[PDB]
Amino acid sequence: PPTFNPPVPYFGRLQGGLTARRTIIIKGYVPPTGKSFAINFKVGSSGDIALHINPRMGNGTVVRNSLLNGSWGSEEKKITHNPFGPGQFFDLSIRCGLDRFKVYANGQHLFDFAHRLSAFQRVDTLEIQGDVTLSYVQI
Numbered sequence: 430p431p432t433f434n435p436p437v438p439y440f441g442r443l444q445g446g447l448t449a450r451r452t453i454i455i456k457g458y459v460p461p462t463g464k465s466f467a468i469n470f471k472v473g474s475s476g477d478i479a480l481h482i483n484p485r486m487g488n489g490t491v492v493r494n495s496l497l498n499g500s501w502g503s504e505e506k507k508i509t510h511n512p513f514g515p516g517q518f519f520d521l522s523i524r525c526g527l528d529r530f531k532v533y534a535n536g537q538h539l540f541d542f543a544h545r546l547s548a549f550q551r552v553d554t555l556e557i558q559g560d561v562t563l564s565y566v567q568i
C-alpha cells in the first residue's frame with residue numbers, strides 16, 4: 430500500500446482497472462540469499478493472473494506466464510539481459526499497451542508479453558511476493 434519502502438507481500442489496487450497506456454514502476458533489490466519472487470497483475474484479490482513475472486535466481490531465468498481459468502499456459506523465457514542478479518538493484522517500468530505488456534528494466538527493453546487475458550481492463554490488482562526488497566512502487 431505505501432509507495433516508498435513497501436513491504437512484501439505488496440497488494441495494491443489499480444483504480445479504474447488496468448487502463449491502456451497505464452505505467453507501473455517497481456524499483457527493488459534482489460537479495461543475495463533469495464531464490465525467487467513474483468510480480469502478478471491480477472483480476473480481483475485471488476482470481477486470474479493476466480501476467481505473472483517470476484525471476485528465478487537459481488537458474489537465472491525470467492519466466493512470464495498467465496494463470497487463466499485455473500491453469501498455467503506456456504512459459505515465455507527469452508531475454509537479452511537478466512537484471513535480477515543476486516544483490517542487484519533494478520528499475521522496472523511496466524506499460525499496459527492495447528495488445529501487449531511492454532516491460533523495461535533499467536531503461537532497457539526486457540520483454541513484450543502479448544495479452545492472453547484480452548480484456549486487460551479487468552486487471553485491478555498488483556501483487557508482489559517472494560524474495561525481493563522494494564524501494565519504490567508507483568501505481
Ligand SMILES: OC[C@H]1O[C@@H](O[C@H]2[C@H](O)[C@@H](O)[C@H](O)O[C@@H]2CO)[C@H](O)[C@@H](O)[C@H]1O
Pocket residue numbers: 481483492493494501504
Ligand atoms: O509457469 C509459471 C509457474 O511455474 C510453476 O513451475 C512450473 C515450472 O516452471 C515448469 O518448468 C514446469 O513444467 O511446471 C511447473 C509447475 O507448473 C511455478 O510453480 C508457479 O509458481 C509459476 O511460477
